[PDB]
Design an enzyme around this catalytic site. Structure first.
Site, PDB file in Angstrom:
ATOM      1  CG  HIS D 182       8.161   9.118  -2.677  1.00  0.00           C
ATOM      2  ND1 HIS D 182       7.284   9.300  -1.636  1.00  0.00           N
ATOM      3  CD2 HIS D 182       7.732   9.891  -3.668  1.00  0.00           C
ATOM      4  CE1 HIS D 182       6.358  10.166  -2.004  1.00  0.00           C
ATOM      5  NE2 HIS D 182       6.616  10.540  -3.231  1.00  0.00           N
ATOM      6  CE1 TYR D 183       2.679   4.503  -2.940  1.00  0.00           C
ATOM      7  CE2 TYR D 183       3.405   6.292  -1.564  1.00  0.00           C
ATOM      8  CZ  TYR D 183       2.688   5.130  -1.723  1.00  0.00           C
ATOM      9  OH  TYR D 183       1.994   4.602  -0.688  1.00  0.00           O
ATOM     10  CB  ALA D 184       9.247   9.609  -6.847  1.00  0.00           C
ATOM     11  CB  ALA D 187       6.650   6.101 -10.520  1.00  0.00           C
TER      12      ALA D 187
END
Ligand SMILES: NC(=O)c1ccc[n+]([C@@H]2O[C@H](COP(=O)([O-])OP(=O)(O)OC[C@H]3O[C@@H](n4cnc5c(N)ncnc54)[C@H](OP(=O)(O)O)[C@@H]3O)[C@@H](O)[C@H]2O)c1
Ligand SMILES: NC(=O)c1ccc[n+]([C@@H]2O[C@H](COP(=O)([O-])OP(=O)(O)OC[C@H]3O[C@@H](n4cnc5c(N)ncnc54)[C@H](OP(=O)(O)O)[C@@H]3O)[C@@H](O)[C@H]2O)c1
Ligand SMILES: NC(=O)c1ccc[n+]([C@@H]2O[C@H](COP(=O)([O-])OP(=O)(O)OC[C@H]3O[C@@H](n4cnc5c(N)ncnc54)[C@H](OP(=O)(O)O)[C@@H]3O)[C@@H](O)[C@H]2O)c1
Ligand SMILES: NC(=O)c1ccc[n+]([C@@H]2O[C@H](COP(=O)([O-])OP(=O)(O)OC[C@H]3O[C@@H](n4cnc5c(N)ncnc54)[C@H](OP(=O)(O)O)[C@@H]3O)[C@@H](O)[C@H]2O)c1
Lengths: 287, 287, 288, 288
Positions: D182-184, D187
């Site tokens: 996930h982009y999480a 990031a």
């Protein structure tokens, strides 16, 4: 799956080539490689120096001196032919040869802008041109020349790691404060990028590319800068040398080259190894 | 504090110099600058082309053609002297001149590694050497030559923004897939870094440095590549051209140059402007 | 038409935009330039009374539509999107500008022992931390997730030739390696800057471009004090803490950036990090 | 002495180390190499029974000391530091390796409409998000804040010539622009990677070096499935999802990295991002 240091990090039977292998950083590399089991061709322009180091510095007599101009497309051809004759393959090419740039453009707080152009414009067009032939062009053709030899080392399979080319860049490829000339830095930035492009192309063919990016190291170039350091307030040494309070040494270089050349480094491709003592974190950079 | 586009983005009275200003990207720049109020010296090697564009393309007759070799240290000296005679200052130097590299090293899935060295080694040592003189050395000396003129534009104060040098880099400075030759890319990486180093040195003296980093643009270089694009599955256009489904155009270049040259861009120094259509996000890069 | 004229290239006439944090500081300078140059701008904040003043007082055409919401709250976003999906039906530009300052910075004064600097480091509250990341990163993600239909619709209405677009206010703190705030602020901005590059990689092929504005020192509610402090600085410290051009940024600087990227001029830009810093980044240790 | 011998350069005899997540996957390969080559290694996990097995079964000299704790919990760190401050009094090396996978990745299959991909995007739970950041970033920060006295003490005991050091397991996801998670996740790794560079900028002058290991694909508990899936891949997909050298990483790869940076060989390294990826990063869109 033996995880002992002597099994992981030995370079026994590794056949290596190191340009600029007879002084400074390149010397600390071949001393590390040869002491720990390798046959290291050193390539320089001074037949002496290569000789003195082949004897005296070897501990097993496996430094084979071999004079050549690593930037000259035709000297590379004769050097490759010789190593194809005497050995038939290499496993590791180390493009370490380097020159200092033109004279740095000095910017002293008591320089007017009119004076700083006087400096800037004085720079010779043939120098700032050559640093690029040694550092970038010279690296390219070194790879082009040894690529059969590097392809052969994969076939002989005397080592489990892939054939590999390492390139000595500089933290000047990221440091934004022109401590040398804008050409040294610009050429190192250029060769660092070409190295990442070659890992992108040629890792799938089994030639890994990596860059060692050194901070301040006692070589023939830095001879004077190192002398000058003895005259600096601690907070200056910390910013111009290393916040750990020393420049690098034989063992630092030994660690890098031994890590990336052994089976330990066998899965590394496209890494920029920054061995700088922490300096880059203190000056304006783009790392 | 008028925030109207016509007040922010006009370049009325701006005196600019654009190398390579008579074709491709450089042309779209001088057309944007002159149509919106500027005097734009265009510097090229072909006296025609500079002429044809000075007439025909101007809308106010403010394109002043001026033949010179932007890489030649001595042509720069005569070009600077002329502009010092006729005008006395400039506000904006745009180092846009560029050449394509040596022929790209082709890697077709049906190329053996033995064949790809044949390619690699064929590259001529004088070319891959020259791209560096135009793109890096040529940019350096262009700055060294115009620095008095740029220092003068700060004094005449015909514009509120600082004097400025812009450098046309490339997304090839970050793209890791060698779509051209490793030398084009390596030279653009080198000049991009030098540009960041010059902003670090000279913004405090009131000369800001910025880089425009173009994706695919219809110029004399790309003439053929653009023709070739018409033969690509959408998913290929999207990866080799732009996922927005077109290459760039006059207005894209007009936006960039007009933003960074006007009062809108008056506080920008050290920016790499990536105008690529989103391509960089799709290929292996280091941006 | 190939009008290379500032008024044709850079106008934003008919552009429908949304700006979180649009009523103070940087976000305000953005809406004032978008609206003055032809756009309809929704400003989203939590303090509704601050949104109302700006919308009545700072508009020049009455096109600032105030709209209270918590841009980090997944459910406030749902109610905001609906209002716009009814009143307007589409947007062309989402600007994730809302931001908070971190926990208190860790003071490292030359007369601090290392024993003292841990005292500082360990004091940092785990919730101020975990919170700056919800506004700057999580909050940006869900803002995009919420407006993606509205952004997809603006491509269909085609009231503007440029693609729909999301802009994210990062920071030069995403690259500056000397923390002038808490390691949490810088780390969140680095995180959101990267997510932005990842979204341009995913969604430009679907016609939503992503770009980052990366500001240096700008007079906002967060920097007020720091700006007051600057007035007591030797030129050489000012050139390094602020800008070697000798000033912080202003309305026109922000106006240039937002107008360049939101207009047809910026219609081919995706994945750009716009560094508007006055040259500061070139002077401090960074990774740009 | 200038012994340029692998056994002299790269041994870690007498090194006192702490490895969060040291009982599975990558963290395990680290402790097995540190302990086999002479170190005393505290492994910190939450599942105490997994720590005990590794400590009894995987040691070769009985120097894996299991020590249960939640490396993200500010208060568990306080109790862990104390145990070590009593039983041992100093450490030389903190390795922040603990990590979680993100929320579920957003599936973008060529036969997904954009309407479907928001359905995905918006489903992401705000707590899985806000949580990956607490482990990877917040958790790393407080781990450093907690052990900083212990790390300062290891410089004083001087049982090793190298400086005290903190290593942080980032990810090539901190630079890879195509989200495979996930982009999480990506990031947070980008955020922690930057914080690590900021800490080397602050604290190397005080004798605590910071470095990041940035792994490609490695067989751990998180990647188990992905590794199973790789067995059904054309060579060309395998060369791009895994490594163009045709394998994922292994015990010896991790052993090389940790042994290089923890020994006297790595004694002058601070601020390095070690990318051990098999060459994958050079093949996907990145920002390295
Ligand atoms: N030392 C540092 O602090 C530092 C910092 C950053 C980067 N570096 C890089 O480290 C590398 C090694 O330089 P050094 O610091 O070790 O300095 P050095 O002691 O001067 O070593 C340079 C070596 O390069 C060789 N060389 C130069 N041009 C050559 C050519 N065309 N063909 C073959 N050999 C050539 C020289 O041998 P001959 O003169 O006999 O040809 C010499 O032995 C360079 O790439 C330099 O940029 C060093
Ligand atoms: N177009 C793209 O897609 C693209 C992408 C990335 C980067 N770029 C960069 O964009 C820049 C502009 O090139 P372009 O794409 O516009 O191609 P172009 O149409 O070929 O323009 C190149 C121009 O450079 C001039 N030039 C070359 N060497 C010169 C010299 N020594 N002195 C003076 N003028 C010189 C040429 O004028 P004369 O031949 O008359 O000297 C010519 O007008 C280059 O730096 C290129 O690398 C372009
Ligand atoms: N100012 C600078 O120099 C500078 C430099 C670098 C980066 N930045 C970045 O710029 C952004 C902030 O701009 P600024 O400096 O102008 O800040 P500012 O003056 O403090 O205004 C920021 C705005 O964010 C809004 N906001 C905060 N959290 C919100 C939420 N959850 N939902 C909705 N609105 C929210 C606030 O409105 P309410 O509180 O009323 O909701 C406020 O109006 C941040 O991303 C910051 O990191 C600023
Ligand atoms: N494996 C890969 O290919 C790969 C690639 C890139 C990056 N990484 C990074 O490597 C790290 C994880 O290594 P791995 O892949 O080997 O993972 P793994 O096999 O799942 O093991 C990770 C360990 O983290 C521990 N852990 C998680 N949260 C914790 C907490 N709050 N306190 C203490 N321990 C905690 C877990 O132990 P308990 O659950 O029992 O506490 C577990 O043993 C992460 O930073 C991950 O992003 C891995």
């Amino acid at each position: 799956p033996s995880l002992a240091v002597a099994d992981l990090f030995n370079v026994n039977g590794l056949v290596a080539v190191v340009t600029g292998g007879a002084t400074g950083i390149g010397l600390m590399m071949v001393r590390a490689l040869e002491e720990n089991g390798a046959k290291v061709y050193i390539v320089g322009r001074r037949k002496e120096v290569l000789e003195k180091v082949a004897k005296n510095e070897a501990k097993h007599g496996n430094i084979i001196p071999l004079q050549g101009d690593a930037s000259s497309k035709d000297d590379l051809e004769r050097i490759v032919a010789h190593i194809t004759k005497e050995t038939g393959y290499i496993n590791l090419l180390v493009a370490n040869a380097g020159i200092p740039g033109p004279a740095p453009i000095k910017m002293s707080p008591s320089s007017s802008l009119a004076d700083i152009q006087k400096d800037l414009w004085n720079t010779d067009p043939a120098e700032f041109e050559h640093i690029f032939n040694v550092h970038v062009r010279g690296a390219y053709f070194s790879f082009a020349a040894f690529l059969p030899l590097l392809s052969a080392g994969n076939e002989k399979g005397n080592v489990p790691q892939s054939s590999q080319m390492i390139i000595t860049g500089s933290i000047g490829a990221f440091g934004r404060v022109p401590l040398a000339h804008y050409a040294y830095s610009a050429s190192k930035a250029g060769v660092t990028h070409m190295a990442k492009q070659l890992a992108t192309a040629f890792t799938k063919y089994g030639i890994r590319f990596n860059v060692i990016a050194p901070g301040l190291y006692p070589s023939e170039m830095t001879e004077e800068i190192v002398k000058g350091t003895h005259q600096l307030t601690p907070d200056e040494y910390a910013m111009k040398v290393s916040p750990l309070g020393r420049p690098g040494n034989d063992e630092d270089v030994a660690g890098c080259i031994l890590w990336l050349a052994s089976k330990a480094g066998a899965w590394v491709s496209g890494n920029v190894l920054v061995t700088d003592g922490g300096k880059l974190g203190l000056v304006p950079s783009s790392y």
